[PDB]
């Protein structure tokens, strides 16, 4: 459950990512595949070599979904319903994987936006990613 300050902290941090959102998304996926190789089992159809266009393209989709989640932070089940259909109903992604990707996104933000990655902002982003994760892994239709 997000507080009003958490929503503001996430909007500020994610806003600072701006146009490089896709780059952060791609790096988080690369970090996830290398750090937690079991996550690759969900992407057998991907070229997962370093600098692969497929990982870059997917990174942009993930990052754009997060931008959409921020923009509809109080209406996430309705706004992310298509992504829950995909991850919970079709792919049946084990929720542990969402904790792994969430951690890799936090790492990416800590490495590239150090001035923005304060302890308060780290706390708000971790809660935000856990809420987005609950929505994507739950069957609510």
């Amino acid at each position: 459950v997000l507080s009003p300050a958490d929503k503001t902290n996430v909007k500020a941090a994610w806003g600072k990512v701006g146009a490089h959102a896709g780059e952060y998304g791609a790096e988080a996926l690369e970090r996830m595949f290398l750090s937690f190789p079991t996550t690759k089992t969900y992407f057998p159809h991907f070229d997962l070599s370093h600098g692969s266009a497929q990982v870059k393209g997917h990174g942009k989709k993930v990052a754009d979904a997060l931008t959409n989640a921020v923009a509809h932070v109080d209406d996430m089940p309705n706004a992310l319903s298509a992504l829950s259909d995909l991850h919970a109903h079709k792919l049946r992604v084990d929720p542990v994987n969402f904790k792994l990707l969430s951690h890799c996104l936090l790492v990416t933000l800590a490495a590239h936006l150090p001035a923005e990655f304060t302890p308060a902002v780290h706390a708000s982003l971790d809660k935000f990613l856990a809420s987005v994760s609950t929505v994507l892994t739950s069957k609510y239709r």
Partner: protein, 146 residues
Amino acid sequence: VHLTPEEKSAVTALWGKVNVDEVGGEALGRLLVVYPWTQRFFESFGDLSTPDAVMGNPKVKAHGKKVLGAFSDGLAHLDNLKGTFATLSELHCDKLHVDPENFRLLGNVLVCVLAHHFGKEFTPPVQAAYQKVVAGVANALAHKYH
């Protein structure tokens, strides 16, 4: 924990540059701010009511330095983590009753702190090597439950 020779070299080189006075305290401080129930284990530290109170608390800094020392010891004994941390595991499991999920959380917060300090130098392959390390340390701290 098995690291490749390239991984061992990159892990050692980065670790040698770690600010021993800051990194441990920042990892512990962030654990307390991000996962607030962990504060229950540190009531003797006094004021932990705000992120600024946590981060500037000298008991958080001193204890964090001890935590960093134990991870440093883990890096020196990757082939014998359970034996090295046998006494530390008895303290956390038998005396403190820390739920093991919290050991994984601290390891990952430490990874976030290393990324925060090293920026672009904390590359995805460097992170991967550090994830093997922190998973091994967390597993050795939880072994007395097993």
